[PDB]
Design a protein around this motif. Structure first.
Motif, PDB file in Angstrom:
ATOM      1  N   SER B  47      13.973 -58.497  13.071  1.00 27.61           N
ATOM      2  CA  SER B  47      13.994 -57.174  12.469  1.00 27.61           C
ATOM      3  C   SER B  47      12.631 -56.580  12.144  1.00 27.61           C
ATOM      4  O   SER B  47      12.600 -55.409  11.769  1.00 27.61           O
ATOM      5  CB  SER B  47      14.801 -57.211  11.173  1.00 27.61           C
ATOM      6  N   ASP B  48      11.514 -57.316  12.274  1.00 29.24           N
ATOM      7  CA  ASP B  48      10.189 -56.730  12.046  1.00 29.24           C
ATOM      8  C   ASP B  48       9.142 -57.307  12.986  1.00 29.24           C
ATOM      9  O   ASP B  48       8.432 -58.265  12.648  1.00 29.24           O
ATOM     10  CB  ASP B  48       9.751 -56.917  10.594  1.00 29.24           C
ATOM     11  N   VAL B  50       6.408 -55.871  13.618  1.00 31.48           N
ATOM     12  CA  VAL B  50       5.077 -55.510  13.153  1.00 31.48           C
ATOM     13  C   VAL B  50       4.498 -56.634  12.307  1.00 31.48           C
ATOM     14  O   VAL B  50       3.497 -57.247  12.686  1.00 31.48           O
ATOM     15  CB  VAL B  50       5.101 -54.169  12.408  1.00 31.48           C
ATOM     16  N   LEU B  51       5.148 -56.966  11.189  1.00 29.61           N
ATOM     17  CA  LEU B  51       4.580 -57.911  10.226  1.00 29.61           C
ATOM     18  C   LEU B  51       5.252 -59.279  10.247  1.00 29.61           C
ATOM     19  O   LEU B  51       4.744 -60.209   9.614  1.00 29.61           O
ATOM     20  CB  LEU B  51       4.664 -57.347   8.798  1.00 29.61           C
TER      21      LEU B  51
END
Ligand code: CLA
Ligand code: CLA
Ligand code: CLA
Ligand code: CLA
Ligand code: CLA
Ligand SMILES: CCCCCCCCCCCCCCCC(=O)OC[C@H](COP(=O)(O)OC[C@@H](O)CO)OC(=O)CCCCCCCCCCCCCCC
Lengths: 122, 51
Positions: B47-48, B50-51
């Motif tokens: 779900s992420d 990016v980070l």
């Protein structure tokens, strides 16, 4: 045409709202002295979109598509109410009764099931 | 008797069983790959990115 239950049963058409010819682009005259009613209001959802949780850093959530898992059980129908003519000339529909709710479960990417009470009660 | 560190020399003149051993090694490596992926899929949070 005039179909019968036995024509429709099991086909999935009972979950479909009626439709109008592509040439029905006319006008219904509203007589303010008159009083009106919706005798049948039918709503057939075709897509369910769910807002994703934008994580703490966020930026902006989108509405993501979902998969329906509860089959052709989703439509609202036989809804009735009076169509009032307001003094400013607008029309207002006030729902009285009908089959005005369906529980629906859609599924998001990753597997999360999202139930909802698809409704227009009141 | 063969010492423990030489047991697999019985294959040196046995092409068939050498192939059988190689087939088994390949089975084990492909199995590992499959098991490792399933474990990673069971534990991955998608779900992420990016980070
Ligand atoms: C690619 C792996 C591989 C292959 C294809 C072979 C193939 C062979 N071995 Mg060799 N061997 C291996 C690994 C392998 N071995 C390892 C790792 C060991 C140390 C245990 C040995 C020890 C060994 C001996 C002592 C002997 C052979 C022998 C032989 C031959 C006959 C089969 C036999 O008796 O096996 C027996 C060996 C096994 C059944 C190895 C089983 C190891 C298990 C599966 C490990 C599992 C641990 C655990 C369950 C893991 C799960 C997670 C855990 C947290 C619970 C044949 C050429 C025999 C032979 O011909 O000698 C001349 C013989 O006497 N091997
Ligand atoms: C593809 C590579 C390859 C192959 C096919 C072989 C094949 C062979 N080796 Mg060589 N060898 C290799 C790589 C390889 N070796 C490497 C990288 C080293 C350096 C470490 C050696 C060092 C070496 C020595 C010093 C000797 C051999 C010997 C042998 C022969 C007997 C081995 C035996 O029965 O072990 C039996 C082994 C066991 C019963 C148990 C071993 C358990 C070990 C310690 C740890 C297990 C690790 C794990 C299970 C799996 C590997 C993980 C990872 C590598 C994938 C056989 C022809 C012997 C020989 O020449 O005899 C004539 C011998 O004396 N090998
Ligand atoms: C006919 C030509 C031909 C072809 C195509 C191959 C192909 C291969 N050989 Mg070689 N081989 C040949 C002739 C050939 N060989 C000859 C004339 C000899 C002398 C006898 C050998 C002796 C030999 C030895 C001793 C070994 C090989 C091995 C291998 C395989 C190594 C890679 C592997 O396992 O991939 C991984 C496998 C896959 C991705 C799946 C493979 C699926 C293929 C398409 C085969 C399907 C079934 C097929 C009908 C079986 C016959 C295979 C073929 C080798 C005859 C590879 C498939 C090694 C091996 O078997 O590795 C385990 C090995 O130990 N070969
Ligand atoms: C290019 C990659 C590659 C190569 C070259 C090899 C080569 C080899 N593998 Mg295979 N293996 C690989 C990838 C590879 N593997 C992968 C990706 C997996 C999945 C994880 C396996 C799983 C696997 C299993 C399950 C077994 C082998 C075995 C073997 C050996 C069989 C021949 C033999 O008798 O050796 C004789 C053995 C030696 C010469 C020992 C060499 C020691 C190496 C360098 C490892 C060093 C020690 C090790 C790190 C200690 C482990 C400690 C840990 C338990 C705490 C050979 C050294 C078999 C084996 O070792 O049989 C005894 C075996 O049982 N391999
Ligand atoms: C049908 C064939 C096939 C296909 C399409 C795949 C596909 C895949 N495998 Mg699987 N795999 C297969 C067979 C196959 N595999 C078999 C038979 C085994 C058992 C040995 C495995 C074991 C295996 C493992 C252990 C892993 C995969 C992984 C993967 C993925 C990454 C592949 C990769 O990076 O390779 C990279 C391959 C190379 C970089 C090979 C380089 C070749 C060297 C340089 C040899 C050069 C020598 C050559 C002879 C000289 C050539 C002469 C030149 C002049 C032409 C991909 C999904 C990876 C994954 O994600 O798993 C979930 C992984 O970790 N595979
Ligand atoms: C999938 C995972 C499966 C993994 C399988 C398990 C791994 C296999 C087992 C390996 C264990 C090896 C045992 C061999 C041990 C043993 O068999 O040794 C004695 C053995 C003697 O061999 P010979 O040539 O005399 O043959 C006798 C035969 O009967 C052996 O089969 O020599 C060798 O093994 C050579 C390597 C010497 C190893 C030296 C180690 C001694 C260290 C002692 C000092 C300890 C530290 C103390 C000081 C701080």
């Amino acid at each position: 045409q005039t179909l019968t239950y036995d024509d429709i049963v099991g086909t999935g058409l009972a979950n479909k709202c009626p439709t109008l010819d592509d040439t029905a682009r006319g006008a219904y005259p509203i007589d303010s002295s008159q009083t009106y009613r919706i005798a049948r209001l039918c709503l057939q959802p075709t897509t369910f979109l769910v807002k994703e949780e934008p994580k703490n850093k966020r930026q902006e959530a989108e509405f993501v598509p979902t998969k329906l898992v509860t089959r052709e059980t989703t439509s609202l129908d036989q809804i009735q109410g009076e169509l009032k003519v307001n003094s400013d000339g607008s029309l207002t529909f006030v729902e009285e009764d009908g089959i005005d709710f369906q529980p629906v479960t859609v599924q998001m990417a990753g597997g999360e099931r999202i139930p909802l009470l698809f409704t227009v009660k009141n | 008797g063969l010492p423990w560190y030489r047991v697999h020399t019985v294959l040196i003149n046995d092409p068939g069983r050498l192939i059988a051993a190689h087939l088994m090694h390949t089975a084990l490596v492909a199995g590992w790959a499959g098991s490792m992926a399933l474990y990673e899929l069971a534990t991955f949070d998608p779900s992420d990115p990016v980070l």
